[PDB]
Design a protein around this nucleic acid. Structure first.
Ligand SMILES: [Mg+2]
Ligand SMILES: [Mg+2]
Ligand SMILES: [Mg+2]
Ligand SMILES: [Mg+2]
Ligand SMILES: [Mg+2]
Ligand SMILES: [Mg+2]
Ligand SMILES: [Mg+2]
Ligand SMILES: [Mg+2]
Ligand SMILES: [Mg+2]
Ligand SMILES: [Mg+2]
Ligand SMILES: [Mg+2]
Ligand SMILES: [Mg+2]
Ligand SMILES: [Mg+2]
Ligand SMILES: [Mg+2]
Ligand SMILES: [Mg+2]
Ligand SMILES: [Mg+2]
Ligand SMILES: [Mg+2]
Ligand SMILES: [Mg+2]
Ligand SMILES: [Mg+2]
Ligand SMILES: [Mg+2]
Ligand SMILES: [Mg+2]
Ligand SMILES: [Mg+2]
Ligand SMILES: [Mg+2]
Lengths: 154, 117, 70
RNA sequence: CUUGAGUCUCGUAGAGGGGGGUAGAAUUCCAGGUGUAGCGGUGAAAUGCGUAGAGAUCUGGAGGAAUACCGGUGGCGAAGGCGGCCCCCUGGACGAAGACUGACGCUCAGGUGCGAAAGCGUGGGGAGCAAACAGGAUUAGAUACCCUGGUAGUCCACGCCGUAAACGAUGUCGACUUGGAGGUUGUGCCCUUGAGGCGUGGCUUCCGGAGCUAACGCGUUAAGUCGACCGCCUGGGGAGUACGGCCGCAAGGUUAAAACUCAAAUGAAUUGACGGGGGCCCGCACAAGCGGUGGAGCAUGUGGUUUAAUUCGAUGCAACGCGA
């Protein structure tokens, strides 16, 4: 907005693991205000992922996030009448949010049957670093590299 | 194959392009590089970053000659004019002298006509 | 704008001196002005405008800006 | 007769004019060295140039044009105009003290001369730039703007032309009328005690009083108060055109109408609105996001077509599940 530095809104942590990040993921996943359903799906996915990959639900989830967060995105600065795609360093809250968003979209795309199954598969893929959300991040980075000449001349 | 240790870096920095040319102190060129050959075209090759990577490329090219000291002669009005020298220093030569040799006439030949844009 | 880096002078410092020397010399400005042929009439007109604006601005600041702004 | 006008003496500053030398920087080209795939250009490209070795870089050479910094609302000139340095020829302005002539003055129709740039003739010269022209883009088109080239011309000699927003849009000469801040160039005194204090001339920039003006503004360099002489105007268009004359190699210049036609055309300022003006600011205006519509079936309203009738109204946002 023009004249607003509004206060960030309060998100409660999810009951199973007490995690704010996990709560945010659930919110992003949710559709039509159906939170209960979203949390069930997220928990199912986490449980399967933990069983498949290892340590905990939260550690596995974190690993996936680490492989899908973007360091740099691009904006379109339009000053000389034409638009320069400029790179820009993506701040941490955005990095988590964007990564989560990408993961959920990839999961939605994916061909497995249950949503939980798709989510688990996608997360595992992210952890390995051979999935589609990861591909998306790679594409974003590639664009930033291409437009690196317009990095610190905005 | 030869070694010289001390070169001159001629940074021709026009508005469109940056040419970097390392030479022996006498005038004979050792290696060169441009933002164009460095992989930038148009809006991208007319930028400081392009000049910097051109400089890096030039330094790499003349690595065979083992040049340690280097004096830089900057020419023209350019987006680099600084990036190139910074890059060269980073690439790791001792910059000894920095000289501007932009050719100003003493009211000589007529310039081309003004652009109407 | 010739500069020679003195003993124990940092590179950044050397760069700073070089830039200052160039600015003082006025090389970039000269080149930019000599990029295209300014007509003599244009040069005269620009000079006149510069003189008028400078004088007017100075008068306004010193004499007109001697009042209570608030 | 000496107060206007001029002469002589001594200095002063000046891109004033004419002629002849010369210097350095830079562009172009040429030859050679080094060296390798790009250069150039643009909003982005392409034409163009480059592996037949370009661009870059160093050396040498050729040649033409123009004189960076100094450089200034600085200076000089009647105006046009004049810009590196040196010499030769040469015109004017200004100050100082005197001396001299003794109204010798001001203006000027015809006339005469000078008169940017472009243009013309003849002979040179030709680097850069660049009408015309060519190709590439852009575009609906693009006989333009932009890009790459490029010939007259720009330069020199000597002739012509004779015009410009040739403008201060302000004819020349003279006198008189409150001020302030500068620039430049003389000169008198003050110890120049220092770059400095007080005068007195010339040219010059800005601001401003009275007065003037339609207003804008001008304001001791008047657009104020006056005197002499000249030039010019009499509604917009037709028209600075036609015809005639004169001048010109030509392009054209100069002098300069009439019919016909309209009731306006203009100047300055005011209030709005508008601007691909400028500054500041807001709004789900964009941005960041989430979900739709536009595809499908159906509901409903509208346009249309059909009908005997398809009642009438709403119909850019701000009509179209609206009156209903
Ligand atoms: Mg050009
Ligand atoms: Mg003189
Ligand atoms: Mg004079
Ligand atoms: Mg006459
Ligand atoms: Mg001429
Ligand atoms: Mg001729
Ligand atoms: Mg000829
Ligand atoms: Mg040309
Ligand atoms: Mg052209
Ligand atoms: Mg006339
Ligand atoms: Mg004039
Ligand atoms: Mg007139
Ligand atoms: Mg007269
Ligand atoms: Mg005034
Ligand atoms: Mg009439
Ligand atoms: Mg005529
Ligand atoms: Mg006639
Ligand atoms: Mg949006
Ligand atoms: Mg539909
Ligand atoms: Mg339809
Ligand atoms: Mg409708
Ligand atoms: Mg109806
Ligand atoms: Mg109706």
């Amino acid at each position: 907005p023009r004249r607003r530095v509004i206060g960030q809104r309060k998100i409660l942590p999810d009951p199973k693991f007490g995690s704010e990040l996990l709560a945010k993921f659930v919110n992003i996943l949710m559709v039509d205000g159906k939170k209960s359903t979203a949390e069930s799906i997220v928990y199912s996915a986490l449980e399967t992922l933990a069983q498949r990959s290892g340590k905990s639900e939260l550690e596995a989830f974190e690993v996936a996030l680490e492989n899908v967060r973007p360091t740099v995105e691009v904006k379109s600065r339009r000053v000389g009448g034409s638009t320069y795609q400029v790179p820009v360093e993506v701040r941490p809250v955005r990095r988590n949010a964007l990564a989560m968003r990408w993961i959920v979209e990839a999961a939605r795309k994916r061909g497995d049957k249950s949503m939980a199954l798709r989510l688990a598969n996608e997360l595992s893929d992210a952890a390995e670093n051979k999935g589609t959300a990861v591909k998306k991040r790679e594409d974003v980075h590639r664009m930033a590299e291409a437009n690196k000449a317009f990095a610190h001349y905005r | 194959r030869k070694q010289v240790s001390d070169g001159v870096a001629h940074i021709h920095a026009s508005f469109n392009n940056t040419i970097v040319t390392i030479t022996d102190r006498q005038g004979n060129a050792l290696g060169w590089a441009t933002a164009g050959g460095s992989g930038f075209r148009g809006s991208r090759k007319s930028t400081p970053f392009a000049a910097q990577v051109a400089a890096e490329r030039c330094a790499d090219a003349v690595k065979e000659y083992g040049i340690k000291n280097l004096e830089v002669m900057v020419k023209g009005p350019g987006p680099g004019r600084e990036s190139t020298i910074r890059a060269l220093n980073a690439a790791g030569f001792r910059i000894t002298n920095i000289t501007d040799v932009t050719p100003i006439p003493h009211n000589g030949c007529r310039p081309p006509k003004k652009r109407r844009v | 704008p010739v500069i020679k880096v003195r003993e124990n002078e940092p590179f950044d410092v050397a760069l700073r001196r070089f830039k200052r020397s160039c600015e003082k010399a006025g090389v970039l400005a000269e080149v930019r002005r000599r990029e295209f042929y300014e007509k003599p009439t244009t040069e005269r007109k620009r000079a006149k405008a510069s003189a008028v604006k400078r004088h007017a601005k100075k008068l306004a600041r010193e004499n007109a800006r001697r009042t209570r702004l608030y």
